[PDB]
Design a protein around this motif. Structure first.
Motif, PDB file in Angstrom:
ATOM      1  N   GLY A   2      87.543   8.017 151.142  1.00 43.03           N
ATOM      2  CA  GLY A   2      87.671   7.060 152.553  1.00 43.03           C
ATOM      3  C   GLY A   2      87.449   5.878 152.028  1.00 43.03           C
ATOM      4  N   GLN A   3      86.984   5.024 153.195  1.00 42.02           N
ATOM      5  CA  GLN A   3      86.415   3.703 153.271  1.00 42.02           C
ATOM      6  C   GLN A   3      84.805   3.802 153.408  1.00 42.02           C
ATOM      7  N   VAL A   4      84.043   2.798 152.706  1.00 38.33           N
ATOM      8  CA  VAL A   4      82.585   2.705 152.884  1.00 38.33           C
ATOM      9  C   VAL A   4      82.420   2.057 154.343  1.00 38.33           C
ATOM     10  N   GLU A   5      82.058   2.625 155.132  1.00 35.32           N
ATOM     11  CA  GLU A   5      81.633   2.026 156.565  1.00 35.32           C
ATOM     12  C   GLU A   5      80.241   1.216 156.599  1.00 35.32           C
ATOM     13  N   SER A   6      79.464   1.725 155.775  1.00 39.85           N
ATOM     14  CA  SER A   6      78.006   1.172 155.757  1.00 39.85           C
ATOM     15  C   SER A   6      76.993   1.967 154.966  1.00 39.85           C
ATOM     16  N   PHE A   7      76.021   1.462 154.797  1.00 39.95           N
ATOM     17  CA  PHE A   7      75.110   2.356 153.789  1.00 39.95           C
ATOM     18  C   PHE A   7      73.610   1.770 154.249  1.00 39.95           C
ATOM     19  N   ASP A   8      72.616   2.523 153.902  1.00 37.45           N
ATOM     20  CA  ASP A   8      71.238   2.156 153.689  1.00 37.45           C
ATOM     21  C   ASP A   8      70.519   2.446 152.819  1.00 37.45           C
ATOM     22  N   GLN A   9      69.335   2.624 152.671  1.00 44.55           N
ATOM     23  CA  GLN A   9      68.477   3.084 151.434  1.00 44.55           C
ATOM     24  C   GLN A   9      68.761   4.313 150.857  1.00 44.55           C
ATOM     25  N   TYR A  10      69.139   5.376 151.712  1.00 43.63           N
ATOM     26  CA  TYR A  10      69.213   6.741 151.346  1.00 43.63           C
ATOM     27  C   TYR A  10      70.864   7.128 151.430  1.00 43.63           C
ATOM     28  N   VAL A  11      71.635   6.569 152.224  1.00 41.00           N
ATOM     29  CA  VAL A  11      72.911   7.172 152.532  1.00 41.00           C
ATOM     30  C   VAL A  11      74.347   6.308 152.330  1.00 41.00           C
TER      31      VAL A  11
ATOM     32  N   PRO B 290      89.799   1.449 149.533  1.00 43.69           N
ATOM     33  CA  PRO B 290      89.237   2.999 149.222  1.00 43.69           C
ATOM     34  C   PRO B 290      88.523   3.172 148.207  1.00 43.69           C
ATOM     35  N   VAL B 291      87.725   4.350 148.443  1.00 43.43           N
ATOM     36  CA  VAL B 291      86.914   4.898 147.281  1.00 43.43           C
ATOM     37  C   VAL B 291      87.190   6.498 147.197  1.00 43.43           C
ATOM     38  N   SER B 292      86.699   6.929 146.042  1.00 40.78           N
ATOM     39  CA  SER B 292      86.519   8.251 145.589  1.00 40.78           C
ATOM     40  C   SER B 292      85.116   8.257 145.344  1.00 40.78           C
ATOM     41  N   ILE B 293      84.217   9.416 145.970  1.00 41.68           N
ATOM     42  CA  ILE B 293      82.834   9.615 145.825  1.00 41.68           C
ATOM     43  C   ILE B 293      82.766  11.083 145.179  1.00 41.68           C
TER      44      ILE B 293
ATOM     45  N   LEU C 154      80.717   7.216 155.110  1.00 39.95           N
ATOM     46  CA  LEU C 154      82.277   7.156 154.541  1.00 39.95           C
ATOM     47  C   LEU C 154      83.156   7.716 155.586  1.00 39.95           C
ATOM     48  N   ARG C 155      84.267   6.902 155.838  1.00 49.34           N
ATOM     49  CA  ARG C 155      85.273   7.127 156.844  1.00 49.34           C
ATOM     50  C   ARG C 155      86.451   7.546 156.389  1.00 49.34           C
ATOM     51  N   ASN C 156      87.066   8.487 156.864  1.00 48.55           N
ATOM     52  CA  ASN C 156      88.360   9.037 156.514  1.00 48.55           C
ATOM     53  C   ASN C 156      89.266   9.027 157.840  1.00 48.55           C
TER      54      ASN C 156
END
Lengths: 68, 68, 68, 68, 68, 68
Positions: free
Chosen positions: E31-40, E18-21, E43-45
């Protein structure tokens, strides 16, 4: 014009002119321009030299004008 | 359109039109556009010429329109 | 100057100098510079190592100057 | 999609549709889109034409939709 | 250092930490880091997966350190 | 990951999922994703379609998850 930001910071650095650096969060920093590069300004006061990101600077106000 | 920001600042600079520069932190600066480059605007008032980063400018409001 | 931001963060990292990192939202983070890359600084305190985006940093204030 | 921001501003400019431009500092500007380039929007109201940096714009709200 | 931001987000994603952004407007997302790319970062809760722009992130604070 | 932001906005656009777009100034916009390009999102509500700059978006929260 062209290539003015570096002559301005260099004049401040070489002439030891005190500056006020206003940041985008409302912090005002004061000190001497020690050095700079593409991304940062190193700002020295009586305590320490801190690293200021240019992206966070709104305006740099010298104690007197520098003549470029 | 294309290549409009430099003609606008140049007209202000050459015609000595007073401006108000609103920054992203809510500071409003007033003075004359002395010069500019890719990154900065040098803004002169009765005290000093200060270096304003374009990235921190939201809008530049002239005292009267400049006709480009 | 040229290529100063990385020597500054590397000196802090290698000498284990505590820092204060002021963010554009007004958060102040404190800890040790663990590592950095083009985009981020990894900042460790007694709880965790967090990932700080450089774009959000206004200034990094060391507890003492580092001599580059 | 691709290449939508310029058709939107051009439609506003050519159809003389009033807009509200919300800036990142909370300023709301109103007027006509006079022109734009890669970096700026020139916004005219009854007083003056001002130069708005796109980097400082959050949203542009037309008085009515433009059909692209 | 070099190429550290992606290993950090990947470790969080794969280990389900779990993270706090913290965002530049003062919003804190969890929430949880679901995925990421160059820009985004996605974040799933418990409600939804939302798309967070990296440009708006100041710091990502894991519930525990990830060892890269 | 790679190339995730466009599939996310496209899914929202094609499935007509309502969104909340939180901007860096604290404005929250609600509506449908009509279209987007490299720089902007066109957001439609019952009144108008407005042009939102991606640089000003912090997070996009769908009413339900989209499965990419």
């Amino acid at each position: 014009g062209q290539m003015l930001a570096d002559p301005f910071l260099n004049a401040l650095r070489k002439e030891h002119v005190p500056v006020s650096i206003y940041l985008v969060n409302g912090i005002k920093l004061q000190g001497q321009v020690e050095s700079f590069d593409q991304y940062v300004v190193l700002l020295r006061n009586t305590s320490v030299t801190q690293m200021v990101y240019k992206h966070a600077i709104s305006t740099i106000v010298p104690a007197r004008s520098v003549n470029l």
